[PDB]
Amino acid sequence: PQITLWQRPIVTIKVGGQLREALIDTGADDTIFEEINLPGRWKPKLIGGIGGFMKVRQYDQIPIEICGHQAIGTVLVGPTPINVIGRNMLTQIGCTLNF
Amino acid sequence: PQITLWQRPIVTIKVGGQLREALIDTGADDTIFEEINLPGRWKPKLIGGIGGFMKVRQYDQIPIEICGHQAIGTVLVGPTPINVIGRNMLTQIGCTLNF
Numbered sequence: 001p002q003i004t005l006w007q008r009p010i011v012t013i014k015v016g017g018q019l020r021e022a023l024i025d026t027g028a029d030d031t032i033f034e035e036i037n038l039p040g041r042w043k044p045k046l047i048g049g050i051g052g053f054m055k056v057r058q059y060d061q062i063p064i065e066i067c068g069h070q071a072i073g074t075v076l077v078g079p080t081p082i083n084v085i086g087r088n089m090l091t092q093i094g095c096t097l098n099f
Numbered sequence: 100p101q102i103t104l105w106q107r108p109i110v111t112i113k114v115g116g117q118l119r120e121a122l123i124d125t126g127a128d129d130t131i132f133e134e135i136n137l138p139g140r141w142k143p144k145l146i147g148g149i150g151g152f153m154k155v156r157q158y159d160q161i162p163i164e165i166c167g168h169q170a171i172g173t174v175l176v177g178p179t180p181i182n183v184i185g186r187n188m189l190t191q192i193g194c195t196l197n198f
């Protein structure tokens with residue numbers, strides 16, 4: 001749908017068989033969740049943001065459903081204070097900015 | 100314009116008489132610039148992001164031009180890795196998400 005920005009643009013997602021809420025985040029290259037449990041192998045990665053860097057687990061080729069749309073791609077797991085859907089997934093569901 | 104997300108959604112802005120580039124960032128509540136020089140009084144603020152907290156100067160009622168569109172609002176100044184236009188400004192220029 002269309003989403004305005006008067007509130008945080010939070011949507012419901014399903015990932016790894018679990019239900020979560022996440023912020024649609026055009027300022028994020030990648031997608032990051034806290035407190036989810038994904039199957040399989042992963043690789044450690046350091047990512048940078050406001051206030052410095054944080055250690056995450058990188059999982060590849062993870063299916064995700066984002067407000068009803070299917071995507072597959074890399075998901076980072078680490079201590080973000082809010083779950084974020086980044087451009088690697090947003091491009092797959094046809095998300096654009098408009099003004 | 101409409102902006103797709105295959106690349107970072109960077110736009111040109113004018114703020115405090117200076118020209119900068121900045122990321123349209125729907126995951127940002129506030130607007131944050133590195134190395135601009137704004138006039139007048141400000142107050143210290145700590146903000147949180149990925150990897151922790153950072154100290155910023157808070158300037159209020161600052162005029163900004165975002166991709167040709169006029170807004171006025173709070174601008175935070177501090178050591179962000181990339182300049183970010185947040186929802187406090189995006190709502191003023193009619194920015195929405197669409198998918």
Ligand SMILES: CC(C)CN(C[C@@H](O)[C@H](Cc1cc(F)cc(F)c1)NC(=O)O[C@H]1[C@H]2CO[C@H]3OC[C@@H]1[C@H]3C2)S(=O)(=O)c1ccc2nc(NC3CC3)sc2c1
Nearest residue numbers: 027028029030047048049050124126127128129148149180
């Ligand atoms: C984490 C989000 C929930 C918030 N943020 C916005 C995101 O869009 C950032 C933007 C950014 C992009 C960069 F390139 C580098 C950066 F430092 C920052 N994205 C990011 O950190 O991305 C990371 C990771 C994700 O994937 C890749 O892409 C880039 C890298 C990389 C790995 S913010 O900046 O912390 C922010 C902004 C305004 C604001 N106002 C406030 N006000 C009140 C106290 C409520 S709190 C507050 C917080």
